Design a protein around this ligand. Structure first.
Ligand SMILES: *[C@@H]1O[C@H](CO)[C@@H](O[C@@H]2O[C@H](CO)[C@@H](O)[C@H](O)[C@H]2NC(C)=O)[C@H](O)[C@H]1NC(C)=O
Ligand SMILES: *[C@@H]1O[C@H](CO)[C@@H](O[C@@H]2O[C@H](CO)[C@@H](O)[C@H](O)[C@H]2NC(C)=O)[C@H](O)[C@H]1NC(C)=O
Ligand SMILES: *[C@@H]1O[C@H](CO)[C@@H](O)[C@H](O)[C@H]1NC(C)=O
Ligand SMILES: *[C@@H]1O[C@H](CO)[C@@H](O)[C@H](O)[C@H]1NC(C)=O
Ligand SMILES: *[C@@H]1O[C@H](CO)[C@@H](O)[C@H](O)[C@H]1NC(C)=O
Ligand SMILES: *[C@@H]1O[C@H](CO)[C@@H](O)[C@H](O)[C@H]1NC(C)=O
Ligand SMILES: *[C@@H]1O[C@H](CO)[C@@H](O)[C@H](O)[C@H]1NC(C)=O
Ligand SMILES: *[C@@H]1O[C@H](CO)[C@@H](O)[C@H](O)[C@H]1NC(C)=O
Ligand SMILES: *[C@@H]1O[C@H](CO)[C@@H](O)[C@H](O)[C@H]1NC(C)=O
Ligand SMILES: *[C@@H]1O[C@H](CO)[C@@H](O)[C@H](O)[C@H]1NC(C)=O
Ligand SMILES: *[C@@H]1O[C@H](CO)[C@@H](O)[C@H](O)[C@H]1NC(C)=O
Ligand SMILES: *[C@@H]1O[C@H](CO)[C@@H](O)[C@H](O)[C@H]1NC(C)=O
Ligand SMILES: *[C@@H]1O[C@H](CO)[C@@H](O)[C@H](O)[C@H]1NC(C)=O
Ligand SMILES: *[C@@H]1O[C@H](CO)[C@@H](O)[C@H](O)[C@H]1NC(C)=O
Lengths: 602, 18, 24, 602, 18, 24
């Protein structure tokens, strides 16, 4: 007897309430619900209307600047699950600056399959620090509760008692409360999400959130898997086909949809893999009659023609339209603003594209760790470049460290150049490897790739200093290395030893007390060369140390600056530019003296 | 065969020129 | 430019014998 | 009876000693003395020869890699003054890595008119910390005693006693000693440099260093001013003419020199202003007969044709060849390596050039504070540019703050662009003013002038925050300002107040404890707007404070980032990028929401 | 006349549209 | 792009009256 209602399309509700209660006869919404700006409503016409028949929303629910909305307790009293088929800027439940919302009161909300929550800028909102956000969301890293009244004043929340279980999330039982008259059902964890009928009884796997009987896929409010004829079922049995991730429809439904969109005006709703997919995927075509996407001879690739040849990617909502196509007829300006590692969603959506007929621009995308998103990118053309005729733009991606893995990834950049200036944690070795593998057709000129202000956050001196002698007895640590000399021995200022008191085995690169040691004597003979080393003062018995040494050298513009760094080994137990300027002055005068004194035969 | 430079040029020319 | 020729690049025996005038 | 000898040209002395004692008959040297590399000499053939007739050297004295030179006590026992007409890399006395020099022993050396000393890399040199360097050099800022034996071991110097006056240079009498058997004559300071004959007796102004009699310009070893017929005289009386800054010659001498160089091969030695100048200056020409540079009709400018159209400037020796000419037929790559402000010499030599038919490149010239050197530069052509077609290159001039004063300086850069990337202490306002005044003919493209990494060392927010209310009684400091709002009020993170305990009135820009204050409320009405201010905690009575406030805002690429900074006023008495990223994320989501919700008529 | 932006656009359009 | 039009630049009364559809 589940879902006693029709199936509602996505809705925009602006201005007044008549459409909001056009939502009376609605047990499920196939689109998005947007209760948008309403100004002439006051907290007295929000009491009579109520919609207890709404069970789930397929895409998301957005509420933005509606006055008089005291609570959602009566508006959505039976909202069980909000799926994440289509998001709104990688958020499945957005609550913006709308005011007069004293409490959330979604006591029947139990899970959100995909997405996050961005309740923010609510000036009069309480009962927010006790909401679960642990049993409703399984991906809690983008939750963005910031600017509500709970962070400005003290509300002094109460909660129904005698008596509703608090749970430990930081180390103490506080509350898991929804409102002044309701709490949220938490049930034994032996079942992840199968339904619990007010006692300890996990229902069948084919039930999501809530159930009313013992194991009975046909008796529960929502289906985790596909829904068919009043029963929650696995992959649709024949002759039923999948539809929009939650229904099992019959062939006639897709026929009617195709006939309606083929002439009236549309997401043709073709059948590929027992799913009534809007469009045939890459490598398949629609012929006639039976709705099937047969494989095409002379491989046919799916293209995503851009609006005007340019696209900015900032969330998963914008990246979801670039799904299923392998050729991009435009350019990508991916720009991930924020402090979250949006990698899985971009890989799933923006991963099948192989040809970009434009420029791959990377703007100020913070928290972007790698470019493995385009794991099938083999060709970046250059038909439509940018100003300066660059084909690969790369602004200050602060957390960018490693580009495409050049051991198993191809590339054929054609008719364009590169642009790598201000990426802090990147290193020039990766850029040069990209140059060698891709074979750039533009041969970028000077200062296109910044030589020095492009790797000064991670040590990639691309050389190793093997330790030779270690002897630690009670208080002295003795070090001996293999001496290293750059092509010009006068550029080596010395070695900068690092050591830190740490008995723990997970130590990374740069607390970290620094010492300076003078370079050895250039004996120019196969002698000991003094094996620079150092003898640190200060030690207590039975401790572990972490040490790694970096070489300090002068900068050379017309060369990749040399360097060396030993691996971080562990001992078991027992005025920075003035010196560079002075060394450069010494070198300059010595070179001038040699040039003046030493001249060839007149 | 190596980059002599510095104090090594003034004591490498000496050997070559003698 | 002897520093130019024997430090940034590689200079052979003949060029050093050429620069021998500076010591003679 | 002064100068009982001939006049020696400049000399190179390599290999052996026969020319060194070709210097027997020599009371003055008109050029440079270079005792260059000598290898087959040992410390036993340096005793018999001595040159007590040498009085002064006109240009400089260079000693480089000579073995067996135990001391200069016998080699140059009468060297009184070394002038600075022509230097060797802005040094008038160079002592390089020559070894076996136990002591300097130039006890008769008393003054160096122009230049410095660079005694360095002497592995066995003592008696160096007691040399005057206060009465010999009047320009002690480039002295470069660094790598001698006195800084590696302890020599334990002795000094002739009973008895030779030490003088205070750091706060204590130590020594002013020359060697184990000699000290240096210091005499009363009532006369700067006029000669003192072993007692308190300042000789005539026309005597330099040493004199033997009472005031008698005709009786002293050296002349401060010009020398004429055995007497030290002022500007040469007629019919005698000046010659090489130290002689008074007669007309026949310049006739003979001109006749010798006009046919045999040469610094034509023409007469302009009673001086036998090598070449006529700008605006004058040589006609015939009488050696005179009459003014030329149809103004004739003097040009300095470069060797191959390119020149690197690194000291005063290289800049001295560009003296007296107004048009440069090449390019300048001025590159001042070091920590000294070489400004007066460059202004005097490299100051009359008006047209540079090339590119004005500025390489890694540290300690360069301004570009007022070319005070007569009105035209930088573009006939011969560099790679990238730039006409004004500017690399990381760390101490560059202020370019040509654009209130009284012209410029006509033609056929070229600009290049301002990594100048730390420079500011974008000066570059844009240069653009407005010069009127660049190239219209440089994007990223030619770095927008952001070009002013992050000096506060030039080009705005003022006037203080409104100050009230300090015993412990509280209250501040009220006029509120400042950028074009987008969401970019203002707040104000960063600075205060430091300082009872002294000379306080400059950025110790300096930092506090953060939240931005006020955007009332959008002519209200108080909360007048942000702050109330610092901690104060003691009867002290002075220094305070100045800077505004923290997000960076905008397509705009000169706004800002404000109050002037440094004095009170009389009584995780930095994560926040920026979060603010940018807030702005990005709000903009996306406004764009999606607000659409025009379909 | 000024750059409205932010929370001021959503409460400036309200006055203009009414 | 309303943020483009009313924040980075200056938008007049007519353009806001045009965007009034988004509220109606
Ligand atoms: C919410 O329901 C889903 C539906 O089973 C739970 O499981 C996730 O299901 C999606 C597919 O819809 C998978 O991609 C995820 O990997 C599943 N997560 C798992 C198995 O942990 C999800 O766990 C439920 N969330 C909560 C908080 O109960
Ligand atoms: C060394 O002798 C000169 C000669 O008079 C002294 O005076 C300097 O003379 C030059 C011109 O040759 C001027 O440019 C300087 O400004 C003069 N300096 C003065 C007057 O202080 C010079 O002082 C002497 N140096 C010492 C250390 O005695
Ligand atoms: C509700 O708004 C619509 C426009 O969206 C309007 O046509 C209708 O008259 C309004 N009804 C009331 C009662 O204001
Ligand atoms: C809901 O269904 C009932 C019965 O068919 C009908 O009377 C009513 O008008 C419907 N309401 C809506 C909003 O469709
Ligand atoms: C679960 O569903 C039953 C049947 O609709 C309902 O009575 C019960 O209150 C629900 N429990 C919740 C929402 O915690
Ligand atoms: C398909 O399902 C619809 C649902 O209303 C039904 O009307 C139709 O008869 C079905 N077609 C077939 C062939 O069963
Ligand atoms: C960019 O490329 C196009 C086509 O090759 C060419 O016409 C144009 O001049 C180029 N511009 C620059 C700045 O290189
Ligand atoms: C290069 O392309 C081949 C396909 O020809 C692919 O199999 C291989 O893994 C790629 N490897 C690299 C390093 O690009
Ligand atoms: C001194 O050196 C010159 C070359 O500079 C050489 O001709 C001469 O024979 C040398 N004299 C001695 C005694 O070695
Ligand atoms: C110096 O002068 C004397 C006397 O004229 C002469 O005998 C001697 O050879 C001269 N020495 C030199 C080096 O000119
Ligand atoms: C000054 O000159 C006289 C005469 O030559 C000399 O005797 C005296 O030693 C000199 N004094 C010095 C060099 O201090
Ligand atoms: C100029 O001086 C020289 C110096 O030797 C002398 O021989 C010559 O006679 C002088 N000429 C005149 C015209 O006095
Ligand atoms: C530089 O200018 C010259 C002459 O105007 C022109 O031939 C050349 O193409 C230019 N090069 C660049 C890179 O702009
Ligand atoms: C510009 O040139 C004139 C000469 O015509 C000069 O007198 C003036 O001082 C210069 N001023 C500026 C600001 O360039």
């Amino acid at each position: 007897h589940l879902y006693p209602g029709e199936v509602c399309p996505g809705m925009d509700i602006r201005n007044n309430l008549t459409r909001l209660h056009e939502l009376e006869n609605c047990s499920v919404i196939e689109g998005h619900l947007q209760i948008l700006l309403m100004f002439k409503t006051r907290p007295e016409d929000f009491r009579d209307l109520s919609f207890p028949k709404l069970i789930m929303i397929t895409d998301y629910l957005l509420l933005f600047r509606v006055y008089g909305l005291e609570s959602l307790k009566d508006l959505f009293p039976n909202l069980t699950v909000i799926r994440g088929s289509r998001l709104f800027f990688n958020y499945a439940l957005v609550i913006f600056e709308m005011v007069h919302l004293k409490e959330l009161g979604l006591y029947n909300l139990m899970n959100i399959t995909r997405g996050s929550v961005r309740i923010e800028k609510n000036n009069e909102l309480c009962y927010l620090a006790t909401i679960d956000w642990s049993r409703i969301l399984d991906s809690v890293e983008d939750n963005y509760i910031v600017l509500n009244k709970d962070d400005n004043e003290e509300c002094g929340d109460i909660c129904p008692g005698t008596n509703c279980p608090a749970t430990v999330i930081n180390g103490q039982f506080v509350e898991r409360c929804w409102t002044h008259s309701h709490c949220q059902k938490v049930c034994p964890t032996i079942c992840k999400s199968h339904g619990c009928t007010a006692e300890g009884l996990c229902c069948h796997s084919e039930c999501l959130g809530n159930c009313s009987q013992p194991d009975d896929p046909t008796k529960c409010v929502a289906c985790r898997n596909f829904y068919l004829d009043g029963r929650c079922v696995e992959t649709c049995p024949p002759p039923y086909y999948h539809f929009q991730d939650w229904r099992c429809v019959n062939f006639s439904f897709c026929q009617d949809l195709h006939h309606k969109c083929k002439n009236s005006r549309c997401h043709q709703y073709v059948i590929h893999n027992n799913k009534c997919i809007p469009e045939c995927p890459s490598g398949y075509t629609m012929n006639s009659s039976n709705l099937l996407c047969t494989p095409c001879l002379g491989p046919c690739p799916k293209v995503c023609h851009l609006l005007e040849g340019e696209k900015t990617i900032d969330s998963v909502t914008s990246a979801q339209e670039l799904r299923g196509c392998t050729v991009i007829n435009g350019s990508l300006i991916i720009n991930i603003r924020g402090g979250n590692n949006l990698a899985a969603e971009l890989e799933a959506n923006l991963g099948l594209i192989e040809e970009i007929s434009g420029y791959l621009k990377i703007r100020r995308s913070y928290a972007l760790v790698s470019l493995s998103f385009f794991r099938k990118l083999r060709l970046i053309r250059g038909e439509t470049l940018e100003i300066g005729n660059y084909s690969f733009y790369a602004l200050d991606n602060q957390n960018l460290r490693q580009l495409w893995d050049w051991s198993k990834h191809n590339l054929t950049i054609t008719q364009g150049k590169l642009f790598f200036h201000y990426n802090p944690k990147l290193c020039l070795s990766e850029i040069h490897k990209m140059e060698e593998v891709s074979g750039t057709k533009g041969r970028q000129e000077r200062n296109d790739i910044a030589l020095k202000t492009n790797g000064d956050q991670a040590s990639c001196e691309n050389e190793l200093l093997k330790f030779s002698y270690i002897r630690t007895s009670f208080d002295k640590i003795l070090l001996r290395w293999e001496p290293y000399w750059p092509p010009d021995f006068r550029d080596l200022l010395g070695f900068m030893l690092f050591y830190k008191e740490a008995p723990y085995q997970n130590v990374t690169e740069f607390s970290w007390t620094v010492v300076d040691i003078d370079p050895p004597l250039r004996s120019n003979d196969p002698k000991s060369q003094n094996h620079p080393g150092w003898l640190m003062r200060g030690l207590k018995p039975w401790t572990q140390y972490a040490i790694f040494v970096k070489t300090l050298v002068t900068f050379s513009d017309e060369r990749r600056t040399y360097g060396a760094k030993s691996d971080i080994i562990y001992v078991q137990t027992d005025q920075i530019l003035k010196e560079l300027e002075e060394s450069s002055f010494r070198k300059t005068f010595e070179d001038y003296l040699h040039n003046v004194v030493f001249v060839p035969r007149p | 065969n190596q980059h002599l430079c510095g104090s090594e040029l003034v004591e490498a020319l000496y050997l070559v020129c003698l | 430019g002897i520093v130019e020729q024997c430090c940034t690049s590689i200079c052979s025996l003949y060029q050093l014998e050429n620069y021998c005038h500076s010591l003679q």
